[PDB]
C-alpha cells in the first residue's frame, strides 16, 4: 500500500468558467470530458483563486503562496516582476526532490514557480476554423495537445506527476480583437446563448472607482464597452466554441493516459488559473473586479483512493491556488513545508471529516501591466462576499446565497453595516497573518482614465494603453 504511489495529472485551462462546465449544472454540452471525470469524482463549489490574472494566479499556485508574497502581482515580464527566488518550495521541487518523474506542458506563464519540472515549449500547428477567428492560443493547444498524448502513451517512470496547460478558452481575447467597437457580427450556425440574468449594471454609482472605469483600463473593455446585446450573445457563444475546442483535447489526454495501465493509478485535477466575465456585469475577459465568473474556478479531481460524490461539496470554501500544493502531497505521501498556509482537502476527497478548513477565501489585484495601478482585495466568507479598492475607498458586499449572480451591492446600506464591518475584520484578519502590505499601498489612476459618466456604454476615447 503506502510505498504504491499514484501518478497525478494536472489539467488546466487558462479562463475556464464554472458556468461553461457541465459538472457545476449551468451550461450543457461544452465539456462533456472533463464533465465525466467529475463523475467519477468530486468537484468544489467554492474554489477562489488568488488573483484573476495569468501571472501572479499561476506564480501564486504552484508555490502555494498568495500574490503579496511571491510579489509577481501583475502581467509584466522582468524586472518589473522578478523570478521567484529558487529556495522557495514549489510543487515541483517537492515532487522531484520525493522521487517523482515531473513533467510540465503547454503555457507556463509562472515566473519561475514552475522549478522543478522538465517543461517542454509547445509548438503552434497552425488551422482554419468555419466559423471563429482562432489565432496562436488554439494553434499552441494542439502543440500541447500532441505532446501530452505522446507522453502518456508511454510513461517513461511511474511515479509521474504531469501538468498539461491549455490556453483556450484564451482564445476569446483575440476574438474580442476581431470584433471590436460598433460591428454587424459574423453568422454562425448554432443555437445563440442567452445573455446572463446578472449581464446589466443596475447603479453605476454604487460600485467602487476602479470597476466603473474598467472600459479605459482594460484594452478588451475598451473594445467591447459600445458592444449591443447581439456582440455579447455572440461572443458567449465564440466563448463556448473554444472551451468545445479544449475539451476535445482533454479528451485526448485522457485517451492517451487511460491507454496504459498507468492511468487506473492516476489522479486526475481539472482547474482553472482564472475565470472570464462572460458578459456578467457587462464585462469581457479578466480586469480588476472580483467577481465569481472570474474568481471562481472549477476545481475537480478524481482517480484512485478519492470517493465519488454525487453533489459539489459547497460546504467548505476553497483556494486552490494554495491548497492544491498540500492536497497533492497529501495524496502523494509527500511531507509539506510548515510555511504554506494552504489545506489539504485530501480527507474530504476520501471520504473522511475535513477538521481543518478555511474560515474565509481571499483575491488580490495590483494591475496587468502598470498602466494602472489600483489595488483590491476580496474576501469570501461563508455566505457574503466582501471587496475593497484603494482607490477611493470603494466596498462591495454580496449575499452570495440570495444574490449569486452579485446583482446588488450591499455596502452602503446601514441595515448590513454589521455584516459589511464584520467582513471588513475578515480582511484585517488576512492582512495580519498573511503580511500583506495592503495598507501601505500607492494608488496610481491617471484621471483621464476617469473622465466620463461611470460605465462602460458611456466610454469615450481609446482607454489607457493608448495615452
Ligand atoms: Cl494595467
Ligand atoms: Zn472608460
Given at each position: 500500500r503506502?510505498?504504491?504511489?499514484?501518478?497525478?495529472?494536472i489539467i488546466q485551462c487558462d479562463h475556464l468558467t464554472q458556468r461553461v462546465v457541465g459538472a457545476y449544472?449551468?451550461?450543457?454540452?461544452?465539456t462533456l470530458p472533463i464533465d465525466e471525470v467529475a463523475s467519477r469524482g468530486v468537484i468544489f463549489s467554492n474554489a477562489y483563486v488568488g488573483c484573476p490574472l495569468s501571472q501572479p494566479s499561476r506564480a501564486a499556485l504552484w508555490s502555494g503562496m498568495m500574490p503579496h508574497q511571491t510579489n509577481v502581482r501583475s502581467n509584466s515580464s522582468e524586472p518589473v516582476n522578478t523570478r521567484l527566488p529558487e529556495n522557495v518550495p514549489t510543487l515541483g521541487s517537492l515532487f522531484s526532490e520525493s522521487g517523482y518523474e515531473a513533467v510540465?506542458?503547454?503555457?507556463?506563464?509562472?515566473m519561475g514557480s514552475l522549478r522543478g519540472?522538465?517543461?517542454?515549449?509547445?509548438?503552434?500547428?497552425?488551422?482554419?476554423?468555419?466559423?471563429?477567428?482562432?489565432?496562436?492560443?488554439?494553434?499552441?493547444?494542439?502543440?500541447?495537445c500532441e505532446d501530452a498524448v505522446a507522453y502518456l502513451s508511454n510513461p517513461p517512470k511511474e511515479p509521474f506527476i504531469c501538468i498539461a496547460d491549455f490556453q483556450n478558452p484564451h482564445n476569446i481575447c483575440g476574438f474580442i480583437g476581431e470584433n471590436a467597437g460598433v460591428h454587424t457580427d459574423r453568422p454562425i450556425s448554432g443555437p445563440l446563448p442567452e445573455l446572463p440574468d446578472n449581464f446589466d449594471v443596475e447603479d453605476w454609482s454604487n460600485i467602487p472607482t476602479p470597476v466603473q472605469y474598467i472600459c479605459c483600463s482594460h484594452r478588451r473593455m475598451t473594445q467591447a464597452a459600445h458592444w449591443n446585446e447581439e456582440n455579447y450573445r455572440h461572443y458567449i457563444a465564440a466563448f463556448q466554441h473554444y472551451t468545445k475546442m479544449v475539451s476535445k483535447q482533454v479528451?485526448?489526454?485522457?485517451?492517451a493516459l487511460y491507454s496504459t495501465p498507468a492511468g487506473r493509478n492516476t489522479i486526475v485535477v481539472i482547474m482553472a488559473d482564472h475565470g472570464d466575465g462572460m458578459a456578467s456585469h457587462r464585462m469581457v475577459t479578466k480586469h480588476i473586479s472580483f467577481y465569481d465568473?472570474?474568481?471562481?474556478?472549477?476545481?475537480i479531481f478524481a482517480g484512485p483512493g478519492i470517493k465519488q460524490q454525487k453533489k459539489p461539496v459547497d460546504h467548505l470554501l476553497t483556494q486552490p491556488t494554495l491548497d492544491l500544493l498540500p492536497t497533492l502531497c497529501d495524496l502523494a505521501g509527500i511531507a509539506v513545508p510548515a510555511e504554506k498556509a494552504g489545506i489539504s482537502l485530501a480527507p474530504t476527497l476520501r471520504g473522511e471529516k475535513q477538521k481543518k478548513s478555511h474560515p474565509y477565501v481571499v483575491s488580490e489585484w495590483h494591475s496587468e501591466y502598470?498602466?494602472?495601478?489600483?489595488?483590491?482585495?476580496?474576501?469570501?466568507?461563508?455566505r457574503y462576499k466582501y471587496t475593497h479598492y484603494l482607490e477611493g475607498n470603494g466596498e462591495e458586499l454580496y449575499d452570495m446565497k440570495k444574490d449569486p449572480g452579485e446583482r446588488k451591492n450591499l455596502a452602503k446600506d446601514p441595515k448590513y453595516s454589521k455584516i459589511l464591518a464584520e467582513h471588513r475584520a475578515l480582511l484585517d484578519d488576512y492582512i495580519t497573518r498573511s503580511k500583506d502590505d495592503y495598507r501601505s499601498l500607492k494608488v496610481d489612476a491617471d484621471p483621464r482614465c476617469r473622465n466620463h459618466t461611470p460605465g462602460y456604454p458611456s466610454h469615450e476615447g481609446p482607454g489607457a494603453r493608448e495615452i
Open positions: 503506502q510505498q504504491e504511489k499514484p501518478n497525478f495529472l449544472g449551468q451550461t450543457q454540452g461544452c510540465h506542458f503547454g503555457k507556463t506563464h509562472d519540472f522538465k517543461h517542454k515549449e509547445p509548438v503552434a500547428k497552425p488551422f482554419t476554423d468555419p466559423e471563429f477567428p482562432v489565432n496562436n492560443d488554439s494553434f499552441l493547444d494542439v502543440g500541447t479528451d485526448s489526454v485522457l485517451k465568473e472570474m474568481t471562481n474556478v472549477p476545481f502598470e498602466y494602472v495601478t489600483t489595488p483590491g482585495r476580496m474576501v469570501r466568507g461563508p
